[PDB]
Design a protein around this nucleic acid. Structure first.
Ligand SMILES: [K+]
Ligand SMILES: [Mn+2]
Ligand SMILES: [Mn+2]
Ligand SMILES: [Mn+2]
Ligand SMILES: [Mn+2]
Length: 135
RNA sequence: ACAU
DNA sequence: CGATGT
């Protein structure tokens, strides 16, 4: 209904899907970039969206912030809620790195607590999420 | 059909 | 046009 401007917005960017994956988090109110992941050689859009939310959870918890997180990915929001990323990406030598990051994110979710609301950014009403890569 |  | 997901 209404944008919660006091929030963190996260998004994936990619070159190919599957392909090179990165993500970033920004202050929804100002667009200031708060964190950026170094590009990962092979992953999927949804894996990256998942890692971006989990990194946001860790970022906010470390600084004792109760702000919500916006994501535009229905899939990734559900995976975080389930603490399980149900990706179809083959597990092989080429995909080992992204799968290590995903498994490690799930492990974090299963060993830590948080109250952070994870909210759907309503692209159809509000335009692109402020962490979008412009591609 | 919806979300990327 | 193709791919990732519920
Ligand atoms: K979008
Ligand atoms: Mn997105
Ligand atoms: Mn796993
Ligand atoms: Mn985007
Ligand atoms: Mn895009």
């Amino acid at each position: 209904e209404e944008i919660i401007w006091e929030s963190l917005s996260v998004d994936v960017g990619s070159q190919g899907n599957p392909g090179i994956v990165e993500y970033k988090g920004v202050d929804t109110k100002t667009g200031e970039v708060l964190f950026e992941r170094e590009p990962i050689p092979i992953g999927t859009n949804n894996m990256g969206e998942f890692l971006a939310i989990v990194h946001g959870l860790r970022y906010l918890k470390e600084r004792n912030s109760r702000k919500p997180i916006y994501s535009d990915s229905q899939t990734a929001i559900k995976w975080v809620k389930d603490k399980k990323a149900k990706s179809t990406l083959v597990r092989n030598e080429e995909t080992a790195l992204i799968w290590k990051l995903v498994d490690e994110a799930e492990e974090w979710l299963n060993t830590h607590t948080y109250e952070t609301p994870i909210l759907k950014w309503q692209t159809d009403k509000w335009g692109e999420i402020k962490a979008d890569y412009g591609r």
